[PDB]
Amino acid sequence: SNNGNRRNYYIAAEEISWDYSVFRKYLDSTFTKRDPRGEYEEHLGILGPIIRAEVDDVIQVRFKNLASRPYSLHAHGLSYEKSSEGKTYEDDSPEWFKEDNAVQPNSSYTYVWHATERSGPESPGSACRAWAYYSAVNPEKDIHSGLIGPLLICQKGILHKDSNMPMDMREFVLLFMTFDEKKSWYYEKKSRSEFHAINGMIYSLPGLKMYEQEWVRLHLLNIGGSQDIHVVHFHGQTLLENGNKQHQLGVWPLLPGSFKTLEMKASKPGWWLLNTEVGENQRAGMQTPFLIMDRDCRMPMGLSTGIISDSQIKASEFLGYWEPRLARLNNGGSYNAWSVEKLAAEFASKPWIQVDMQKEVIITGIQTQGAKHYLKSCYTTEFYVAYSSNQINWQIFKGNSTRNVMYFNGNSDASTIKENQFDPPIVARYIRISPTRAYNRPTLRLELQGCEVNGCSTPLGMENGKIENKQITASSFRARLNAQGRVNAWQAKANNNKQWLEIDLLKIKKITAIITQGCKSLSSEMYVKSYTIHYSEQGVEWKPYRLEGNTNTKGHVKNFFNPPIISRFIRVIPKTWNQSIALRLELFGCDIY
């Protein structure tokens, strides 16, 4: 069944030993082209690559072996010639076509798989349905091992080549198999030739992908050991069946062998749980979320204003004394752009840094705005980033997303804060960031964007007619915050646990964070150094912290209340004092429903 175009499509099989609590993808005609499963695929684990073709296009599958087991591969609803299955049975014809059943290691072929128009997309209500490949020598001994992979089939044409990634849509390949301890092969030693998790990782496996106001192409393609007539549990957003457009239920008992392309419509921020609704098999209990965030973390978060403190914005290998600390977003000054003399550590120790918001962040990306001197252009062309959660696994980001390639194009200009969106989630505490090529010196001032699980610190509405602050009552006086035509100061009375911050809000919402910004109150700002964070429930209520403030005058400095606080009353008696109060206050937050 010769039909379409000829392109390289290389697969292999590197057998390892994977601690529970295997293929990859090569690109050229021969081998030698390792593309690491980045964060875009850092949860597939036992799942190999994702073979991707369209309507009736050639599927080259060169494969071999690297251990003690011949492989093969089965085909479902695909078009191909006779000898392309791999199973010893009766042959009414002679023994000629028997060179696809016992594959010996290190053997390059040239397969030819297709998806017939009537076998691929038919009745176009099924857009991208999930197929699969699997060596059918012993589906109980190699699919139960996880030598596995899908074959996502969509339309014929509209998808940028050769990225073959789903555009305007995400993708999940979760074979919900009961990967048991008694039957593992490549990692286990005993049978080389109670745990219900994707890729056999119980209690864990975070890092699931998501993006707000979109859907998914979810696949519960369970094809292994047919005893897992499972029953899927799913919180967050519900999965309703399409194709057969009359199954908008939401929870579906997972039957083996079958498959369905579910959609869920992510639309509620936060962490949610998973589970397996089988009675005693719920002890698996997956606490795995795909962190839905607020849709409005598209703007910078700490270099223009300056909470990503200018102290540790340091180049690892320094250069004279143009350190990245004196720089700001278009800083009024010639020296305002980090660039170390370019050395030829071709991929390891190029001018790199270590930076952080000093808290947990979900990095959307970094941008920059250059300020060329008069001859020094000061501009970079490409970029890479590595993440380190515990400061010993500084793991690089060589993604393979829709617009992410090996060295995914980050900073590449001289002036425009270039937009870069990290499509897979960022779970990091610190990082090391190294741009490469420039005019003899890589120039960068990072513009970070992030949002934590809540991060609702938007203008809460201090004057929205619902939650006023102008009346700010306390034991230090009602006042005049942005009701001008007035004097230019704030005045307190003493310095101890004196006030009560009865900010007439009286709204039950979810101001997830609080911020204490500065001003210019006739001198240096006086503020609240800290407050015995006392509660504020429905009654005449106080509570010593058994459920810091501003410290420097000029700065959007925040001391977030570590656990979320939500109640009826509003009050925060200040335990300390900056010798007084002197700042037009403006807190930030939002409202949940």
Partner 1 sequence: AQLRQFYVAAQGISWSYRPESVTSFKKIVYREYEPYFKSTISGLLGPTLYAEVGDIIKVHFKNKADKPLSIHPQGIRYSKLSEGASYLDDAVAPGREYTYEWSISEDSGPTHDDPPCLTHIYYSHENLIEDFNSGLIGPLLICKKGTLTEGGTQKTFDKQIVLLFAVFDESKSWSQSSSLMYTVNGYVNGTMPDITVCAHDHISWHLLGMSSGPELFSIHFNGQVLEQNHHKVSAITLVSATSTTANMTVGPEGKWIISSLTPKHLQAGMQAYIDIKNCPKKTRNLKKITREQRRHMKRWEYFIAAEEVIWDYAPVIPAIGKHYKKVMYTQYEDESFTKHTVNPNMKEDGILGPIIRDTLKIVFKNMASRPYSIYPHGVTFSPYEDEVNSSFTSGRNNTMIRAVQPGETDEPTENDAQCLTRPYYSDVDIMRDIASGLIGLLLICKSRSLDRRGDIEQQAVFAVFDENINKFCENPDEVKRDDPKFYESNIMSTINGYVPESITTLGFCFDDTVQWHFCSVGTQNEILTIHFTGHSFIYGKRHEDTLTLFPMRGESVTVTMDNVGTWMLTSMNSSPRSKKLRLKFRDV
List the interface residues with partner 1, window 109-148 (CB under 8 A). Answer: 116, 118-119, 122-123, 125-126, 131, 139-140
Cβ contact 264:214 at 8 Å: no
Q: In the complex with partner 1, which residue's Cβ is closer, 56 or 447?
A: 56
Q: Does 287 bind partner 1 (CB under 8 A)?
A: yes
Q: Is 562 a binder of partner 1 (CB under 8 A)?
A: no
- Cβ atoms of residues 33 and 11 within 8 Å: no
Q: CA angle at residue 68 from 63 to 70, to 5 degrees?
A: 40
Binding of partner 1 by 279 (CB under 8 A): yes
| Binds partner 1 (CB under 8 A): choice among 70, 166, 207, 225 | 225
Nearer to partner 1 by C-beta: 161 or 546? 546
- Which of 17, 39, 37 has the alpha carbon at shortest distance from 26? 37
By CB atoms closer than 10 A (0-12, 13-18, 19+), residue 123 is: exposed
Residue 295 binds to partner 1 (criterion: CB under 8 A)? no
Residue 252 as a binder of partner 1 (CB under 8 A): the answer is: yes
Contact between residue 298 and residue 449 where contact means Cβ atoms under 8 Å apart: yes
The verdict on 510 binding partner 1 (CB under 8 A) reads: yes
Q: How far apart are CA 542 and CA 58, in angstroms?
A: 71
For the chain, the C-alpha Rg in angstroms (whole number) is 29
Check if the beta carbon of residue 510 is closer than 8 Å to that of residue 546: no
Interface stretch with partner 1, choices 13-21, 87-95, 340-348, 395-403 (CB under 8 A): 87-95
Size of the site for partner 1 (CB under 8 A): 73
**Closer residue to partner 1 (CB): 55 or 355:** 55
Classified as helix, coil or strand, 200 is helix
Among 49, 149, 150, 236, binds partner 1 (CB under 8 A): 236
Piece in contact with partner 1 (CB under 8 A), picked from 256-264, 333-341, 420-428, 483-491: 256-264
Asked if residue 386 binds partner 1 (CB under 8 A), the reply is no
Q: How far is the CB of 200 from partner 1 (least distance, A)?
A: 17
| Gap between the Cα atoms of 473 and 516, Å rounded | 17
Binders of partner 1 among residues 47 to 86 (CB under 8 A) are 75-82, 85
* Ranges within 352-381 binding partner 1 (CB under 8 A): none
C-beta of 269: minimal distance to partner 1 in Å?
8
User: Which of 231, 326 has the CB closer to partner 1?
Assistant: 231
Separation between Cα atoms, residue 288 and residue 146, nearest integer Å: 20
Binding to partner 1 (CB under 8 A): which residues in 566-585? 566
Select the span of 145-153, 247-255, 367-375, 548-556 touching partner 1 (CB under 8 A): 247-255
For the chain, helix (H) and strand (E) counts, in that order, are 0, 12
Please identify, using beta-carbon distances, which residue of 234 and 387 lies nearer to partner 1.
234
Measure the CA–CA gap between 276 and 263, rounded to whole angstroms: 19
CB of 4 to partner 1, least distance (A): 17
Torsions phi, psi for 276 (to 5 deg): -125, 120
170 close to 217: Cβ distance less than 8 angstroms: yes
Residue 298 touches partner 1, criterion: CB under 8 A: no
Query: Is 196 a known ligand-binding residue?
Result: no
Question: φ, ψ for residue 282 (rounded to 5)?
Answer: -70, -15
Q: Does 233 appear as a known binding residue?
A: yes
Sorted by sequence, the CB contacts under 8 Å of residue 516 that are 6+ apart come out as: 527, 528, 549, 550, 557, 558, 559, 583, 585, 587
CB 20 → partner 1: shortest distance, Å?
Answer: 20
DSSP-derived letter for residue 103 is: P
Point out which span in 280-288, 457-465, 478-486, 544-552 binds partner 1 (CB under 8 A).
280-288
94 binds partner 1 (CB under 8 A): no
Q: Which residues are annotated as a binding site?
A: 233, 235
- Per the annotation, where are the binding residues for Cu cation? 233, 235
